[PDB]
Each structure stands twice: as C-alpha cells, then as structure tokens.
Structure 1
Amino acid sequence: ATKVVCVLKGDGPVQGIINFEQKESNGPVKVWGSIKGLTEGLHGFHVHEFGDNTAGCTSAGPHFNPLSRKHGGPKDEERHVGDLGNVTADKDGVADVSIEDSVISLSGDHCIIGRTLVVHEKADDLGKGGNEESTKTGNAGSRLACGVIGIAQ
C-alpha cells in the first residue's frame, strides 16, 4: 500500500530499477528489481544518507544511519538502517534483486524516501572484515550507480 522506486545510473552502463513496497507501516518492505552491467559476484547495496546526486554518487554521503549504530549486514541487530547487504550479479552481469527487510521503512524515521540507493564496486563484508572501515562502510569500494528513492504510483 506504499510503493517507492529508484532508478540506478552510473558508468559502464551500470543501470537498474529497484522497487520497494510496504503493505503497512509496521510491516516489512519488499525490495525487487534488476541491475545490469555489473561484474560477476557480490556488490554492496546500501541506502545512503543524502538524496543528493548533484555531483554524482559521491554527494550521497555515508550510510543512512538514523539510529547511530555501527555497520552490519541486513540480518544483524547492529546495523545501519541503510544496510541492505549485497546483491549478486551473474556471469552475464545481471543481479536480480529480491529482498525483504524489516528495518528499512517507507514511513517514519526509518523511512528511505528522499535518500540515495547505491550499488558498490566490491562486496560488503557486513562488518566482518576486521578493520576500522568494516564497521563503518563494509569496505564495498567505489559507487558504481545510484539514484534518489522516490514515491511511486
């Protein structure tokens, strides 16, 4: 009953459409869509704090972290709201995304509307990499494609 969408663009072309839908404010958000143009393997997948793409994906800032937690994987209690783990691209460079998440929302202070979705160069280590950056960014590397998360029909 609330639906939101994000078109991801960057060089390659890396390009994708990701849809989000939440039946009720207390419920999980289903996330689905496709990203093409990726290298085979894992790519970090995060909601970043700013829906600012004025100078490309760099202006999106850090992970969306309204509750001031450390970086983790989607299944972790200790995670940022924006920590959606990794998407996995096949040999053909396509990641078909199908996620349900209970921490992001389309309502309230966990809401991701107006933020940026980013797909990264490398895997997110989900805070298990053993360095300073692991519990901040997951060491997922450069931002390959991004877009602002908007209200859908």
Structure 2
Amino acid sequence: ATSAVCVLSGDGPVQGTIHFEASGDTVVVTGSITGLTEGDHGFHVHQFGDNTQGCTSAGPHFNPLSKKHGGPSDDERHVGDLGNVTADKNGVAIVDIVDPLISLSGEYSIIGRTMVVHEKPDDLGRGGNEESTSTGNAGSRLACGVIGIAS
C-alpha cells in the first residue's frame, strides 16, 4: 500500500481522520482531530487492530524492536511512538508528521493496526516512573480506529 487512512472514534466527542502516504522512503502523516481539550495529547500506533473492546483491545504500543517508550526523535522508542499532537483553544489538533520508523508495507507496516489519541500529554519516556517507559503517562484512550488501505 502507498496510502492509508484511519477514522478515529470513541465514547466521547473526540473524532478525527488521519491520512498516511508513503513518499520516497518515508511515511507522511496528516489530518486533524477535533473535540480535544486544549494542550498536548499522546498520539500512538498500538499493536492490534482489534476494537472488540473499544480502544482497550488495541494492546500496547507497536514495538517490534522491543524497546522502551520514547519520543519520535529518540533512538530508544517504540515504532508506534509518534509523540504528541497539540489541540488549540477550540479543541482542534492539526497533524503533520513525517516518521522514519513506521511503514505501510513489510515488517514495520502499520496497516491493520490501531491509531490512538490519548487523554494526557505523552512525557516522551522522561517522566521517571515505570509507566513513563511504557506509555509516557499518556493515560486513557479517547478515540481510536483501525488503519486501512486507501485509494
């Protein structure tokens, strides 16, 4: 696949559409998320594209290299660690990310996995407790969707 899309939904007001495109040797992530509280929100690819129990069944962060959680610019990060998205005063977050670890094909493919937007800011693995090294203390999953092949 060269293009993918994800519609985020949850039990609250948070909604959004995220587009993925393979450009050259990298992946470009764009889109927008609405209904968020102003501020930073963790934004990650979780391992499973299973929404049988809402976003809970998406599992932990996608992590084929078995590393600890970090920010997108770190060497020590999960493949799914895309950092934070920032919502304005109106609750809108514009997504504009380029990432060197995710892919749309092969071992690092995120097709069929779940994009999640979280309640709190991701501390990028620097919070100092065990939880920071797993999830960045980003908290609950406000909305999520399975990443599918797009035209």
Q: TM-score range by the shorter chain?
A: over 0.9
> What residue in structure 1 maps to residue 114 of structure 2?
116
Show the 5 A alignment for 1:8-87.
8-24=8-24, 27-87=25-85
**1:101 alignment counterpart:** 99
Q: Runs of at least 4 residues of structure 1 off by over 4 A?
A: none
Q: Which letter does structure 2 place at the counterpart of 1:12? A: G
How many residue pairs get aligned? The number is 151
Unaligned runs of 5+ in 1: none
Q: Percent identity?
A: 78
Displacement of 1:11 in angstroms is: 2.7
| Residue in 2 that maps onto 1:151 | 149
CA RMSD of aligned residues (A): 0.9
- Could you tell me which amino acid in structure 2 is paired with residue 129 of structure 1? G
Gaps of 5+ in 2: none
Residues 90-140 of structure 1: per-residue CA shift (max 9 Å, x gap): 000000110011111111111100000000000000000000010111000
Deviation at 1:28, TM superposition (A): 1.2
Using the alignment, how far apart are the partners of 2:50 and 2:5 within structure 1? 16
How many angstroms apart in 2 are the aligned matches of 1:107 and 1:74? 20
TM-score, scaled to structure 2: 0.98
